[PDB]
Design a protein around this nucleic acid. Structure first.
Length: 252
DNA sequence: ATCCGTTA
DNA sequence: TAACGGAT
């Protein structure tokens, strides 16, 4: 099957991703910005216990690292009844220099799909932002406090990869993946490839071209260090769901 | 928690 | 001006 032919391309079998061709990202601040340190709001034991295994997993993966930084933003526990960590980066966002929004809206993106190409493959990349390294100079920006009362733990952690909740993450990811897939596009001029951050659609004129193109796209993505969800993959179908649309009979 | 634009 | 929804 597809899962077995391309072990490196799937999140399920290829391990955590890392975009090896992309330089670690440097995040420019606005001209008058200085660090802001917001105290961590006290967290309930219930929330802390819920969040803990996620933090530990990220530490084990090297995605979080200990740090000491003049920046600090609060971690929010957000439920489901399962607490997960959500960093409030709003005050960091306000101090980071704006970039032009280059990600197309889905409506316009889909306008680039011709009736000629009606065989589809849809992939979503797992933990997309985390595949992009953050330059060490920019890591301190995103620090938060992690305390474990019953383990004498108290200090800051920060991200070594592009973080969730950062205003520029979707745009920077979209632009990075475009750079990495530029060659694939050149090597396969007959294929249509739509990118919406971590949501991809490959379209072909025939089931064959689609299966061949999909094989190529999977091999390329895996080689570049990205990882797609095998669970959710829609491979070589006449009908697929993409960006909240049902694509069928060239409609939508 | 906190913030901020939109409705009531 | 008080809710309310959705946001990080």
């Amino acid at each position: 099957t597809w899962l077995s032919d391309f072990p490196q391309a799937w999140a399920e079998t290829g391990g955590m991703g890392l975009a090896v061709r992309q330089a670690p990202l440097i995040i420019p601040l606005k001209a008058t910005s200085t660090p802001v340190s917001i105290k961590q709001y006290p967290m309930s034991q219930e929330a802390r216990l819920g969040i803990k295994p996620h933090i530990q997993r990220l530490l084990d993966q090297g995605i979080l690292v200990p740090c000491q930084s003049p920046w600090n933003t609060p971690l929010l526990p957000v439920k489901t009844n399962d607490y997960r960590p959500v960093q409030d980066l709003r005050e960091v966002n306000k101090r980071v220099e704006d970039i032009h929004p280059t990600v197309p809206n889905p409506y316009n993106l889909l306008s680039g799909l011709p009736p000629s190409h009606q065989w589809y493959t849809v992939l979503d990349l797992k933990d997309a932002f985390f595949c992009l390294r953050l330059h060490p100079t920019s890591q301190p920006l995103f620090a938060f406090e992690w305390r474990d009362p019953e383990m004498g733990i108290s200090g800051q952690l920060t991200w070594t990869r592009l973080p969730q909740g950062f205003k520029n993450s979707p745009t920077l990811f979209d632009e990075a993946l475009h750079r990495d897939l530029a060659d694939f596009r050149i090597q396969h001029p007959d294929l249509i490839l739509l990118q919406y951050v971590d949501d991809l659609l490959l379209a072909a004129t025939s089931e064959l071209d689609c299966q061949q193109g999909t094989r190529a796209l999977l091999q390329t993505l895996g080689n570049l260090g990205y990882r797609a969800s095998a669970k959710k993959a829609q491979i070589c179908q006449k009908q697929v769901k993409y960006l909240g649309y049902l694509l069928k009979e060239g409609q939508r």
